[PDB]
Structure 1
Amino acid sequence: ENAAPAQAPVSDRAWALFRALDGKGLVPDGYVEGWKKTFEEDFSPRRGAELVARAWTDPEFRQLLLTDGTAAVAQYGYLGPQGEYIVAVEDTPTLKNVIVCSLCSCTAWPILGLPPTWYKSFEYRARVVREPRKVLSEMGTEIASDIEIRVYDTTAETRYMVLPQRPAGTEGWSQEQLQEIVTKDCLIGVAIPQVPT
């Protein structure tokens, strides 16, 4: 009762799917290998970090990013699969934004990278919509009682990034220095950019 079904090892199933399709001429030469390279090397939170650092130092770009995210991202050539309609959401002294896909794993791939295992977890998918303060606290981010937490559930085609607050102690930093402190977790919204002691 309630037992798992019999299954061949997952690697054997996944490669069987590949071989079945490839053996019928349905997969172009180097097709999956090319996607693997795109997923590993091109889709990256370093891109989102570049966008944040630019917004932090360029008031005009910041306004474009917050009103037409797609156009702002396009200037850098960072539009792509699962990242064609972009909305950036602005943290403020009274507002912390957090992103989830409660129904599966929907993520702005090209600018955040493919979602991490934890973002796809049933724990995150179930809990962050209902108790984001506790979830963030458990993850190592304390959000004070007066700051409104706003959770964006990625249920359609909008793909989100968080524009975090620029921390004190970074005045005059170069775009490269600022990029360094904007991590994947800052873009998802579960972390706040950290300045070294």
Structure 2
Amino acid sequence: ENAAPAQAAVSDRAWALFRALDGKGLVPDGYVEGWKKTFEEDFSPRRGAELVARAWTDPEFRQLLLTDGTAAVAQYGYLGPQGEYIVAVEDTPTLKNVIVCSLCSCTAWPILGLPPTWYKSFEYRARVVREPRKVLSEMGTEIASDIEIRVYDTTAETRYMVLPQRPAGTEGWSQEQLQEIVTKDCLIGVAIPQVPTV
């Protein structure tokens, strides 16, 4: 009945696609290797942390992110393929924002980075829209009852980024320091920035 279709080893099939196109000279020399480096080294959440840290320290920039995110990001030259129209959503003491792409895995590559396996998993895609609080708690983030949870589903071309709340423990920390607190998960809206007392 529901038998899985016969297929060759996945690697064999991945390289067969490559070898086919390459044999016809449809793929530029160094093209594939070039992109790999971009994905691994260039697209990094560190760029997102940078924007957040600055937004905490400089109120003028904060307003730029919240009003014209694309401009603010362009100002750093952190624009890219899956991140041409950026909108930053901020977390107030009574609001928590989370991002999802139920239909696929659309994320702001240049600022957050390539989507992690769990972000593109059937369970996250299906559950977070209906039961955010349950999903977050299981992940390790407990959101109080008086805090409204807003889930943004990346359907069109808009790519989101979350502007977390500034942890009270940082009395006059430097931008450099604040940068280490803002982790990838904070940018996706799944985690809350905490002061590493280790």
TM (normalized to structure 1)? 0.99
Report SS of the residue matched to 1:135.
Answer: helix
Q: Distance in 1 between matches of 2:193 and 2:165?
A: 8
Q: CA deviation at 1:20?
A: 0.3
Percent identity, please.
99
TM (normalized to structure 2)? 0.99
Structure 2 spans left out of the alignment, 5+ residues: none
Report SS of the residue matched to 1:123.
Answer: helix
Q: CA deviation at 1:196?
A: 2.3
Q: Distance in 1 between matches of 2:196 and 2:44?
A: 23
1:48-100 per-position Cα deviation (integer Å, ceiling 9, x unaligned):
00000000000000000001000000010000010000000000000000000
Q: Distance in 2 between matches of 1:9 and 1:159?
A: 34
Q: CA deviation at 1:172?
A: 0.7
1:105-131 per-position Cα deviation (integer Å, ceiling 9, x unaligned):
000000000000000000000000000
Structure 1 runs (4+) greater than 2 angstroms displaced: none
Q: CA deviation at 1:171?
A: 1.9
The yes-or-no answer on 1:45 pairing with 2:45 is yes
Q: Distance in 2 between matches of 1:183 and 1:32?
A: 29
Q: Aligned residue pairs: how many?
A: 197
Q: CA deviation at 1:137?
A: 0.2
Q: CA deviation at 1:146?
A: 0.8
The yes-or-no answer on 1:128 pairing with 2:147 is no
Q: Distance in 1 between matches of 2:171 and 2:70?
A: 28
Q: CA deviation at 1:40?
A: 0.1
Q: Distance in 2 between matches of 1:25 and 1:92?
A: 53
1:14-66 per-position Cα deviation (integer Å, ceiling 9, x unaligned):
00000100110100000000000000000010000000000000000000000
